[PDB]
Write an enzyme that holds these catalytic residues in place. Sequence first.
Site: not given
Lengths: 174, 353, 375
Positions: A1, A33, A45, A124
């Site tokens: 993500t 998201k 988000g 990430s």
Amino acid sequence: TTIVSVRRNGHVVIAGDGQATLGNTVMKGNVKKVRRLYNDKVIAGFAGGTADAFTLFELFERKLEMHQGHLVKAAVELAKDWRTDRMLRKLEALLAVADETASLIITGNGDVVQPENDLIAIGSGGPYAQAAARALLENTELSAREIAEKALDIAGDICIYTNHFHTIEELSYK
Amino acid sequence: MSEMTPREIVSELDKHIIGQDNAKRSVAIALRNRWRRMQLNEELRHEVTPKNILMIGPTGVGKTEIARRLAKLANAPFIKVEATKFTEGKEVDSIIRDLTDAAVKMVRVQAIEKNRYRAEPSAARQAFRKKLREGQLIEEEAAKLVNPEELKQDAIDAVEQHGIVFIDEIDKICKRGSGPDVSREGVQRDLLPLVEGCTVSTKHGMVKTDHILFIASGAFQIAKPSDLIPELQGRLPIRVELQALTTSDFERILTEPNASITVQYKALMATEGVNIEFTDSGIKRIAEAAWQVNESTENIGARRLHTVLERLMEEISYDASDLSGQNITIDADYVSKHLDALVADEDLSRFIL
Amino acid sequence: MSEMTPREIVSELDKHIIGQDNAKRSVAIALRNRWRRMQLNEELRHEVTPKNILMIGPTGVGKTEIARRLAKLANAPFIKVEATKFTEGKEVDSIIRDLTDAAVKMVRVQAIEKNRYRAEELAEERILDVLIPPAEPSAARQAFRKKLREGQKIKDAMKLLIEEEAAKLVNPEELKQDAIDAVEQHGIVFIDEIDKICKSGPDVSREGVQRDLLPLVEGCTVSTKHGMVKTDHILFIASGAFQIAKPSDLIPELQGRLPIRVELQALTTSDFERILTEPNASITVQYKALMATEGVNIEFTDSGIKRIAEAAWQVNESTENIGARRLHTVLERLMEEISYDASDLSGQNITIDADYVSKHLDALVADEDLSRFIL
Ligand SMILES: Nc1ncnc2c1ncn2[C@H]1C[C@H](O)[C@@H](COP(=O)(O)OP(=O)(O)O)O1
Ligand SMILES: Nc1ncnc2c1ncn2[C@H]1C[C@H](O)[C@@H](COP(=O)(O)OP(=O)(O)O)O1
């Protein structure tokens, strides 16, 4: 993500990928998201479980109504209840939110943070996006939408947990 | 009782409340349906029930003052109750009991007013009567004129027909989603019979709640009206949202309303022989000052106007005895002198203001 | 008391409730057994006990209205009690206490209706004694009687005699004792949301309310300031959605004291259109007569009624389903502009058409975020 936020020339945006990973497999590639909040005056988000964000976002709108839409003070009250409540403490997510005033990050540790230049990059792949968005913002005149778009694509090429499906919510205040 | 049309009600409310016309229009419809019901036949008067109202908005925007002036406008019995009081405890039936005890004192003091003025003459007779009025039985005559059996039976009819109940902060008994939600929703069930037409016993008599009007209020920022129990949502036919007050409204509230707090301070300093006068710029900066504290710390609505004005006038109100015969002007410089030092420090504003 | 046959009861309920005939048929059997019992001998009248009913269905489908119109049809005492009130606390015996207090005010006001007539005659004969003191009515006795009825402390005195005469005419031992007979013989109690007290912690307090209720249905005696009442022949109506729990979850002593079971169907959009108009004193008729008081004439088109029921249906589906109660919130929101202006619109004929309904409502129904606050 990965999720990115950029603010330039009276404009601010939030962009994020749609990848949802389960172990080493892709569960869903079109995840939304990013969304709008508080009568579309706020964009936000999230990196984490979809329901955990929808709970935090709804409460965040509540804190905005108590504080008349003040972003910072409402973010503290959300971070305050998040760490405190035994129910909310179980939630695991990384929120990003911004308005015409300023951009800031919220976490489950209770920490509220406003990045340098209001440049948010989480997930990430967040550090990869921050590296690319930092390069364009200083070396180009590109609009904040173009920076978050190109930065998120580079993070998807690098991060294995990030894909190139994109969702964006711009806010113009000039 | 009163035959006032809905616009005549709103026009009277504008003499006290500033703006919030939608709330004024909604209460006017409910009070006008009262007179409309009496004109109907025997059957419809039982089927028709009061159109209860639910006010929605932030604190201090006048949700209560509309309810107070409305009951004061109709001379109806009135009571305010905090819905959270029953979270712990007291019975809900006390609402009707206290409303009647207020209706009793209302009709009784109003009955004394009829008994007060009541409570060839000889030339020597008029002479002593003139010396008497110049200066030099109210109990026994007012007791002789009063009809205690009438005052008690009247207050019940004043409650059953005209009674008004304001349930403040109803939003806080809505479900937050388990523990409190049972106690919170349990209060909603306990209130249900009062709006569904039950009967409550009182020492003054047996009162019926069918036709009493009710006015709930709540910010509903946390919860929403849909979080109310379905039996309760249908008993509140009329909904309205009160707008947040602006700095311009603070400027109007200080002056325009009848017996405005500025007018009250002027008459109070007139008692000391002092003459107060507020400049339009001074009223402006006062309204600007109250808005800053609400935005800087916590927004308490128009109630902030009270704490600021008293902090500004505290020096005059203390010296007003020694300043007798003087004309004091509250100008923009005078407002900035006594306040800007305080408003600038948010840590102190949470105490002094 | 009333000798109405079960079909006569359902036909009267059809004047107010729409549909739900099975609930109407079930309550009618219970009221008929009342009259059937009195015809029986001394022994069977004791052994027979009321056939209690358990209504089942989603909220707002008229469970309570059947119980209300049923008691109003019988002129019986009635009370609605939320079963969850006892989870926290008040005693369960208060149900019979509050029922008798309603029965007291019911028989009392009804007794005033009888005294309202005779007392005016005896009150007139009293006030004529001061105008024409006595030493066929005298000519002056009628000449004053005419000026009195034409209208005129004197004016206060006519009110005081209604009390002394209605007090002289009333029989308080027959009245306070009548409400007890009205409660014991005709009494009715509606226990809303009984399903929520079904079954570890709460299950003891939940089922504890059931055991506390048990004596009232099995039969017992409760003390009240008005007198001593027995609950053996009182009829009861319990109601609950029973989506979380089922009647079988009720304590066994309670399942056997509810012989009659009935499920109430969910109302449809077509039923909403009927509820708006068909029932006697329907809310549409109420708004019409109310605006008539201001000199205005309201009229609803069939398509205008059709789009109100569709409006209430969309909110129940879009957000939360509160049943027919939604019709009240939607109608007042539609009529709020007329209800305010009705004073200035006197002498005008207003028509509520489909275009008018869509004008005032579709903007609100379209936004679900607003519907939760306004509708
Ligand atoms: N719209 C308005 N016009 C005039 N005065 C107002 C006002 N709103 C508030 N005030 C003043 C009068 C009251 O003494 C005080 C508190 O108002 P309130 O009616 O208690 O607000 P709330 O109903 O939110 O509690 O503020
Ligand atoms: N079948 C029906 N016919 C007419 N009106 C109805 C109805 N069902 C509900 N209503 C309206 C009239 C009542 O004032 C209101 C409350 O309904 P209710 O009888 O309390 O439902 P419930 O007993 O399921 O809670 O809804």
